Amino acid sequence: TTLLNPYFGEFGGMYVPQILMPALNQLEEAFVSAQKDPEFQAQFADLLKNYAGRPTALTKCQNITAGTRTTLYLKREDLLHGGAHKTNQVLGQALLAKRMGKSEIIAETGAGQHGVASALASALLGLKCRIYMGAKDVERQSPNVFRMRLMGAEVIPVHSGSATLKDACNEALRDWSGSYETAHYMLGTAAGPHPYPTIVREFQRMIGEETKAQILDKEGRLPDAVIACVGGGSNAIGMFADFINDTSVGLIGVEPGGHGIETGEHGAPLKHGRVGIYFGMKAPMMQTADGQIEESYSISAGLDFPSVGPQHAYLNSIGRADYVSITDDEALEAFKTLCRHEGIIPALESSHALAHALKMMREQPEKEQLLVVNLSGRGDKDIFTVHDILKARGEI
Amino acid sequence: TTLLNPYFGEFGGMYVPQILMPALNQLEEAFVSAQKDPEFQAQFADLLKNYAGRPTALTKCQNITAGTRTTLYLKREDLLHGGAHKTNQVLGQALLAKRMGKSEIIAETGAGQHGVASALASALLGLKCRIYMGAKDVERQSPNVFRMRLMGAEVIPVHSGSATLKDACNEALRDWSGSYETAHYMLGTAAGPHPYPTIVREFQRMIGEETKAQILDKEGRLPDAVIACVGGGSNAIGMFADFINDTSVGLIGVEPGGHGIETGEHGAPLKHGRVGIYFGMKAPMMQTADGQIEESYSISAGLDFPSVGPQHAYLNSIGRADYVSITDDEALEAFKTLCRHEGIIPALESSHALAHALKMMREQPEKEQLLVVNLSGRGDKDIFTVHDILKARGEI
Amino acid sequence: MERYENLFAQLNDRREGAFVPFVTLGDPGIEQSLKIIDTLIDAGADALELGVPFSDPLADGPTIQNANLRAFAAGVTPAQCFEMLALIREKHPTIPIGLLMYANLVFNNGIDAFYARCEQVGVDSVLVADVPVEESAPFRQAALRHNIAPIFICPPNADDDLLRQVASYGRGYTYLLSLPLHHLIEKLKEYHAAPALQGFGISSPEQVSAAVRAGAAGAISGSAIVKIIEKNLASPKQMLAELRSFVSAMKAASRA
Amino acid sequence: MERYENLFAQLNDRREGAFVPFVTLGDPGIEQSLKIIDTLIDAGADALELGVPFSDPLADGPTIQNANLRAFAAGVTPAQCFEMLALIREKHPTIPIGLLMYANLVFNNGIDAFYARCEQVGVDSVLVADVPVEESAPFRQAALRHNIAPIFICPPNADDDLLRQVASYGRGYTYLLSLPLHHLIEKLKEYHAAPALQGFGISSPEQVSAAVRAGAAGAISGSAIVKIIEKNLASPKQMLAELRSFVSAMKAASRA
Ligand SMILES: *Cc1c(COP(=O)(O)O)cnc(C)c1O
Ligand SMILES: *Cc1c(COP(=O)(O)O)cnc(C)c1O
Ligand SMILES: [Cl-]
Ligand SMILES: [Cl-]
Ligand SMILES: [Cl-]
Ligand SMILES: [Cl-]
Ligand SMILES: [Cl-]
Ligand SMILES: [Cl-]
Ligand SMILES: [Cl-]
Ligand SMILES: [Cl-]
Ligand SMILES: [Cl-]
Ligand SMILES: [Cl-]
Ligand SMILES: [Cl-]
Ligand SMILES: [Cl-]
Ligand SMILES: [Cl-]
Ligand SMILES: [Cl-]
Ligand SMILES: [Cs+]
Ligand SMILES: [Cs+]
Ligand SMILES: [Cs+]
Ligand SMILES: [Cs+]
Ligand SMILES: [Cs+]
Ligand SMILES: [Cs+]
C-alpha cells in the first residue's frame, strides 16, 4: 500500500528487496506530510533564497541568435550555490531527513557533483554525511573528492561490480537497509524507486515555475519550447513540471549521444536503450542483450547515469515530451560558442541542451521561435577536459 | 581642470604622463554624464540583474557562531556570475566604453580573475578584448588564461620589470596612451589615477546598498560592522560606500598579513607600507627604502596588489574606517571552517575577511554584535592551493 | 514446488531440519562449479539455492558480490547457467533446486518465458531478490503457471500484513531473515505459510540446530559456502574437501 | 637652468641645433656607463638626458625598459646614480645635464630634498615622466628653488591651454613629442616657452635636420643611443666606437 501512485504509466515502481520497503514507505509519508506543512515549505523557501540564491536569472542571449528569428533565454541554474541545479533538491531532502528525526545522510555520486551537493547541504544543516563513489570515479574526480572532504563528508570508494556510479547506487542502498532508522538516503536524480522520482521533481520544480513567471514578465507569453539535458532526469523534470499542463509548450529532453548513437558509445537509453528493471525501477536501461546493466558513455561525466527517470519515459510514451540526442562534438561546439559569444562557461552537461537549441535555430533560421534552455550548471569544472580535446585535435 | 576632485584628502591624484591626461579627462566626463543618464543606469541594472544575477543573497551563518553573541551574515558575491564581485564593475566600465564609442578593451590582471571578468564582459557586449598579464602570472594561472582565451580575449604576457601584476599595470597604460580613441582601459580595482577609484566604487556600491536593505529587512537595524578584504580596495569600498554616512556602522578592511607583518612578507601597505607615487596615484605602497616598488605577498594571489586604493587611505586617516591584517594561517583556518560548518567554499581572499570576523567573535564571545562579511568570491579556484598546504603540513 | 513438499514431508517423518547451501553458478568456473555442487549434494545438502551472476546484486553482501565477479571473470552468462541447471537436474532427480535471481534477468526476455525455461530445466523455486511482495504479482503468477514456487523473504522488519501476504502468496518455503523469532515462526504457521528456512547468519552447526529448535523447517547458509570457495581458489581439491567437511557438519546439526 | 640659457644663446649665434642623447645611468654597469657618457660628450653631445633606473618606467618603451633591467642586474641604485652625476659634472663644467625621473624617486625622501641634491651634484633640469602639468606644482616649485629647470612634455595631443601652461611653467627646454608640428613650435615661441627640443623618433641624421628646419632648437634621441648599447654588450670597445660614430653623425646634422 502506498499513498501515491508509484508508477508513471508502466514505468517506475518500487523494485527493492523487502527489507527496504519500510524505508520507502516512511519517506513517502514524510514527503506527503511535508508538502502540506507550511512550516516545512517556509524553511525550504528560506534555504533556497538566502543560502542558495533563488530566484536564478533568466538571461536573454542576443549575440548567439543574431540574424535569426530565434529568441533564446537561458535559465541560470549555473548561478545557484554549488554551480548546478542539484543544490535545490538536496536542501529539500535534507529537510525531509530532519523531519523524520534522522541525523545522518547517505549519498551516491558519479562525477561527484551530487556528492558535493549532498556534502554542502549536510554541512549547513548539521547532518553527518557519507558518500559512496565508484573507485574508478574517485580516481578521476580528485577535485570533487577534496571538496566533499573539506565539507566534512566521509567519502567511501566502492570496488564491487564495475566500480562506477551504478555500483555506488547499489552500495548506498545496502547501507540504508541497515541504517534507515537514523540515516536518510539522499538519491541524486529523479529516478530510483518511488517515492524518489516524485520527490526530486517536486524539489526541482521551482526551476520551471520561475521560468514561467520570468518569461511572462519579459515576453508576455509562454515559450515555444523548453530544452534540458537528461542524465537521470532531475534538471529536465524540474524545468518541465510546471509546463506539463501548458500543452502548447514543447518539452525537449536531450540525452548524450557520445561518439554517435550508431557507435553504441552513448548515454541515450530513453531513445536507444531497452526497458529493464534496475535501481528500484522499471525504465529504459543501457544493458547487454542478455540483461546485464551497462555504462552510459558521454564526454560529460554528469550525463553518465545508465538509466533515465520513469516520468521521462512516460512523458515520451504519451507524446507530451520529445527526446533527442546530442553528440560529444556538438556539445563541445555549443560550449565554445557560449563562452565566446555570451561570456558564460556552461557545464558540458548543459552544453548538450544548448547544442540542440542551436540546431533548432540554425536548421530553420527564419522560423520565429521563443526557446528556453535550462543551463543546469557552470563549466569551470570542465575546462581541463575541453583543453585536452582541443590540444589533441590540434586546435591548441 | 577636472569635473570631480581627483583626491581623497592628500591621497589619489592623476600621476600619469601628459599624453594620458586627455584619456582620463574623456573618461571622467563620460562617467559624470552616465551617472545622470537614466538610460545608462537602466542598461547597467539590466545586465546586473539578468546577466550577473543581482541581487546576491545575504546568508545568516548559524553553525559558525553557535554559542556566542555574534550574529554573522555573509554577503554572497561568491554567487555572482564569474564567482566574484569583479563582475559588477567590469559590466559598468564596458558600458562606459560603449558610451564613448569604443570597440576595444584593454585590461591588466594578476591572479587572472580580473582578466576573466574583463573577457566575459567584453564577450557579452561584443567588444574586442586584450589582457596584459605578467609572464610569471601567466605560467602559474593556466586555468584563468584558458578561460580568457575561451571567451575570445587575447592574452599578452608581459616580460618587463618583475613580470608580475604591477608590470602588466604599466603595459596596459602604455597601450592605452596610443589607442585610447578606440580602446578603453578597464582597470581592475578602486585604485590608479582619477577617475578610476571613483568609478570603481560607484560601480560596486550595489554591494553595500543591497546589504543595507537586506539587514534592515532581516534584523530591523544596521550592522555593528561590515568587514571586507582589501587587495586593491574594490570589494571593500563597494561594501562600505553606502554606510559611510551611517557613522555607527564600523567599516573594517582586512589586508593580507602573509607570513606575518614582522617577516616583511605580507601585502599590507595601508598599515605597514609607506606613501609613495605609482600607478597614477599617491597612496601607501610596498616599496624599498630607496623607493623601488615591491611585491605584495599573500597565500591569496588576489590580494597581491602592492598598493591600495586612495579612498581607503583617506578613510583610515580620518578614522572613519579601521584596517587590520590576517595571516595566511588565519585565512586558511577560516576557509576550512566555512567549508565544514556552512557548506560554502570561500575564496582565500574573502577568507581573510571571514577570519577577522571569527576573531572578533572568538576574542569576545559574550559581546553582542551584528556583523556582515563581504564574501567577495568563491574558492573552487583555491582548492589545489589549499590541498598542497594541507598535505605539506601532514594534515593529508 | 512439489519437490519441496516431498522433502519437508520426508524430513518431518525423521524429525529432521533441512540444510540448504547457496552458491553462485559458475563460480569460480563452470566445471569447478558443477563439481562444487555435486560435492554439496553428496555431503548432505537437502536442497540448493543457486545464484545467476548479475551485474548489480543489490540484496547481496561482499562475499557474494565477489563470487559474481569471479563468475564474470570466467565469462559465465545466464544461458550457460541454464545449461548447468539442466545438467544438475539430470544428475539428481529429487533434490529441490531454487534460484536466486534479480528482476532484470527475469524480465529481460519476458517474465513468462523465464519461468517456462525454469520449468524446462527442472528448477523448483525462484526468489527474485529485488521484487517485494507489493510488486510480485506477474512474477508469482508466471511461477505458479510453470509449477515453480515463488519464494518470499520475511525480513527482520516484517509486520502482520506482510506475514499474511508472504503466507498467502509464497510456496515451497518462506525465506526467513532474522517481532521475536519464535513469534514470526509461530505466526507464519498460523497463517499456513510455506515452511520457514532461516537464512540469516547461518555459518556454524549451532545455528542450524538453533533454527530447528526455534520451530523453523531448516536453515540456509547464504554465504558461508562461498567463503570456502573464495579461500581455496588455488587448490580445487582442498576446496572440495573443505566444502564436504562443512556441509557434512552443518547437515549433522539438523538431524534428530 | 642657466646652462641651457647659455647653450641656446651660443648655438643661436652659430645658427646651430642642439643634439641631446638619452642614456640610463649605470647601464650596463657604473664604469661602462661613465665611459659611454664621456664618449657621447666627446663625440659632440650638446646636452645630456640621464635616466635613473626605476622599477616601473611607465613612460618608457621596450628599449629603455631593458636598459633599466640591465642597470638593476648591475645593482645600480639612485644613490649610486647621484655619485655618478657628481663625477660627470666635475669633469664637464658647461654641458647641461637633465634627469629623467619617476615621481616616486623624487617624492621618496622628500621632494624638496631631491631637488636640493640635484643642485648639489650639478644637475640643470628634471623631467618627471609621470607628473602632468596639472600635478606639477610642488615639483616645479622645488626645482626653481634649487635653480633646476622643470621640463615638461608637449605631447601629440596637446591643446592651446596646455601650450600656455607648458610655456609659462617650463624652463630650460620644452620636450616636444610629435595641431601640426610647425604650429606647435610657432605657438610655443609666441607664448615665450623654453626652446623646443624634438624628442619623437630621433634615430637618424635626417630627423635632426628636419627638427631644426621646423623651427625647433634641437633634437633628443630618446632611445637610439640605448639601442647601440644593447646591441654591443659583448664588446665595450666596439660599443664606444659605434656610439662615437652615431653621435658624431647626429651632431653634424644640426650644424649650419
Ligand atoms: C548532475 C547534473 C546533470 C545531470 O543530472 P540530471 O539529474 O539529469 O539533471 C546535468 N547538468 C548538471 C550541471 C549536473 O550537475
Ligand atoms: C580580486 C578579488 C579581491 C581583491 O580585489 P579588491 O579590488 O580588493 O576587491 C578579493 N576577493 C576576490 C574574490 C577577488 O576576486
Ligand atoms: Cl554525481
Ligand atoms: Cl585535489
Ligand atoms: Cl580536509
Ligand atoms: Cl514587464
Ligand atoms: Cl526503449
Ligand atoms: Cl586579477
Ligand atoms: Cl588549462
Ligand atoms: Cl580557445
Ligand atoms: Cl521582515
Ligand atoms: Cl603609511
Ligand atoms: Cl523440533
Ligand atoms: Cl545431531
Ligand atoms: Cl633654421
Ligand atoms: Cl651639415
Ligand atoms: Cs534574434
Ligand atoms: Cs539519459
Ligand atoms: Cs549566535
Ligand atoms: Cs592592500
Ligand atoms: Cs502457502
Ligand atoms: Cs618659460
| Catalytic positions of B, written as ranges | 61, 85
Closest CA of chain A from B333, distance in Å: 11
C-alpha span between A147 and A120 (Å, rounded): 9
Does the beta-carbon distance from A339 to B122 stay under 8 Å?
A: no
C-alpha span between A185 and A118 (Å, rounded): 10
Does the beta-carbon distance from B291 to D78 stay under 8 Å?
A: yes
Query: Is D190 designated active site?
Result: no
3-class SS of residue B31: helix
Listed in sequence order, the DSSP H helices in chain B are 21-34, 38-46, 86-99, 113-125, 135-140, 142-150, 165-179, 196-202, 206-219, 234-240, 269-272, 310-317, 328-342, 348-363, 383-392
Half-sphere exposure of C112 (CA within 13 A, CB side): 1
- Which of D228, D159, D192 is CA-nearest to residue D21? D228
C-alpha span between A71 and B231 (Å, rounded): 41
B positions 278-297 inside 8 Å of D (CB): 278-280, 282, 285, 287, 290-293
- How far is the CA of B214 from the CAs of A49, B369, B376, D65, in angstroms? 12, 17, 17, 50
C-alpha span between B89 and B197 (Å, rounded): 11
C-alpha span between A290 and A267 (Å, rounded): 19
Q: Which of B79, B376, B380 to mutate to test the pocket of ligand 2 (most atoms within 8 A of CB)?
A: B376
C-alpha C73 to ligand 7 mean position (Å) = 29
Look up residue D11 and give its three cell numbers.
Answer: 648655438
C72 neighbors C18 (Cβ within 8 angstroms): no
Which partners does chain B have (≥3 C-beta pairs < 8 Å)?
A, D
SS (H, E, C) C198-250: ECCCCCCHHHHHHHHHCCCCEEEECCHHHHHHHHCCCCHHHHHHHHHHHHHHH
Q: From the CB of B307, is ligand 2 less than 6 Å away?
A: no
Query: Is D60 designated active site?
Result: yes
3-class SS of residue B4: coil
Q: Is B394 in CB contact (< 8 Å) with chain A? A: no
C-alpha span between A238 and A217 (Å, rounded): 20
Half-sphere exposure of B107 (CA within 13 A, CB side): 33
Does the beta-carbon distance from A287 to C104 stay under 8 Å?
A: yes
Which amino acid, one-letter code, is at A175? D
Q: Determine how β-strand A274-278 pairs with β-strand C153-154.
A: unpaired
Number of B to D CB contacts under 8 A, please give it: 89
Cis peptide before B346 (omega within 30 of 0): no
Cis peptide before A38 (omega within 30 of 0): no
Look up residue D131 and give its three cell numbers.
Answer: 607628473
A285 neighbors A274 (Cβ within 8 angstroms): yes
* All structural domains of chain B: 8-52+86-204 (3.40.50.1100), 53-85+205-390 (3.40.50.1100)
- Give the technique used to solve this structure: X-ray
Please identify which residue in the block is written with the cell numbers 553557535.
Answer: B66
Q: Is D133 in CB contact (< 8 Å) with chain B? A: yes
Sheet containing C125-128, strands listed edge to edge, beginning at the edge strand earlier in sequence: C149-150, C125-128, C97-101, C48-51, C18-24, C218-221, C196-198, C174-176, C153-154
Please identify which residue in the block is written with the cell numbers 554606510.
Answer: B243
Please name the residues in contact with B375: beta carbons below 8 A apart, sequence gap of 6 or more: B74, B75, B76, B77, B78, B344, B346, B347, B350, B353, B354
D107 neighbors B276 (Cβ within 8 angstroms): yes
- Which of B87, B157, B85 is CA-nearest to residue B124? B87
Does the beta-carbon distance from B293 to D104 stay under 8 Å?
A: yes
CA terminus-to-terminus distance, chain A: 60
Closest CA of chain C from A2, distance in Å: 10
B211 neighbors B301 (Cβ within 8 angstroms): no
C-alpha span between D55 and B263 (Å, rounded): 22
Please name the residues in contact with D141: beta carbons below 8 A apart, sequence gap of 6 or more: none
Ordered DSSP codes for D212-254: HHTT-SEEEESSHHHHHHHHTTT-HHHHHHHHHHHHHHHHHTT
Ordered DSSP codes for A106-168: EEEESSSHHHHHHHHHHHHHT-EEEEEEEHHHHHH-HHHHHHHHHTT-EEEEE-STTSSHHHH
- How far is the CA of B333 from the CAs of B337, C209, D45, in angstroms? 6, 59, 63
3-class SS of residue A183: strand
Q: Determine how β-strand A280-285 pairs with β-strand A11-15.
A: antiparallel
- By residue count, chain A amounts to 396
Sheet containing B128-134, strands listed edge to edge, beginning at the edge strand earlier in sequence: B154-158, B128-134, B104-109, B183-185
Please identify which residue in the block is written with the cell numbers 536518510.
Answer: A184
Closest CA of chain D from B382, distance in Å: 30
Percent helix / strand / coil, chain A, rounded to 5: 45, 20, 30
DSSP class of residue D29 equals: -
C-alpha span between B71 and B207 (Å, rounded): 19
- Which of D94, D116, D89, D134 is CA-nearest to residue D8? D94
Q: From the CB of B86, is ligand 2 less than 6 Å away?
A: yes
Chains D and B touch (3+ CB pairs under 8 A): yes
Ordered DSSP codes for C89-137: HHH-SSS-EEEEE-HHHHHTT-HHHHHHHHHHHT--EEEETT--GGG-H
Which amino acid, one-letter code, is at C168? S
C134 contacts in chain A (CB < 8 Å): 1-2, 14, 21
In chain B, what is the greatest distance between 2 CA atoms, to the nearest angstrom? Answer: 60
Question: For D132, which of B18, B160, B293 is closest by C-beta distance?
Answer: B18
Question: For A290, which of C57, C58, C78 is closest by C-beta distance?
Answer: C78
Please name the residues in contact with D157: beta carbons below 8 A apart, sequence gap of 6 or more: B19, B22
Q: Which of C16, C27, C46, C49 is catalytic?
A: C49
CA–chain centroid gap for C144, Å, is 18
Q: Is D93 exposed, middle or buried (0-12, 13-18, 19+ CB in 10 A)?
A: exposed
Q: Is D131 in CB contact (< 8 Å) with chain B? A: yes
Q: From the CB of B84, is ligand 2 less than 6 Å away?
A: yes
Q: Is A21 in CB contact (< 8 Å) with chain C? A: yes
Q: Is A67 in CB contact (< 8 Å) with chain B? A: no
Listed in sequence order, the DSSP H helices in chain D are 2-13, 30-43, 62-73, 78-91, 103-107, 111-121, 137-145, 160-169, 181-190, 205-213, 224-231, 236-252
Q: From the CB of B325, is ligand 2 less than 6 Å away?
A: no
Ordered DSSP codes for A385-396: HHHHHHHHTT--
Look up residue D176 and give its three cell numbers.
Answer: 616636444
Does the beta-carbon distance from B19 to D177 stay under 8 Å?
A: yes
Q: Is D12 exposed, middle or buried (0-12, 13-18, 19+ CB in 10 A)?
A: exposed
CA–chain centroid gap for B15, Å, is 21
Which amino acid, one-letter code, is at A17? P
B24 contacts in chain D (CB < 8 Å): none
Please name the residue whose Cα sits nearest to atom 13 of ligand 1.
A377
Please name the residues in contact with D86: beta carbons below 8 A apart, sequence gap of 6 or more: D120, D121, D122
Q: How many CB atoms lie within 10 A of CB B10?
A: 13
Please name the residue whose Cα sits nearest to atom 4 of ligand 1.
A231
Write out residues with Cβ below 6 Å of ligand 1: A 84, 86, 113, 189, 229-236, 302-303, 347, 349-350, 376-377
Sheet containing A321-327, strands listed edge to edge, beginning at the edge strand earlier in sequence: A58-60, A70-76, A369-375, A225-229, A250-258, A321-327
A372 neighbors A215 (Cβ within 8 angstroms): yes
User: Which residues are paired to B109 by β-bridges?
Assistant: B133
Closest CA of chain B from D240, distance in Å: 26
Quick one: which atom of ligand 1 is closest to the CA of A78? 13
A60 contacts in chain B (CB < 8 Å): 50
Half-sphere exposure of B284 (CA within 13 A, CB side): 24
B106 neighbors B122 (Cβ within 8 angstroms): no
Q: How many CB atoms lie within 10 A of CB D240?
A: 21
C-alpha C154 to ligand 21 mean position (Å) = 13
- Which of D180, D173, D154 is CA-nearest to residue D165? D154
Nearest CA in chain B to A118: B343
The DSSP element (H or E) to which C19 belongs, if any, is strand C18-24
C-alpha span between B215 and B369 (Å, rounded): 13
C-alpha C95 to ligand 13 mean position (Å) = 22
Quick one: which atom of ligand 2 is closest to the CA of B235? 9
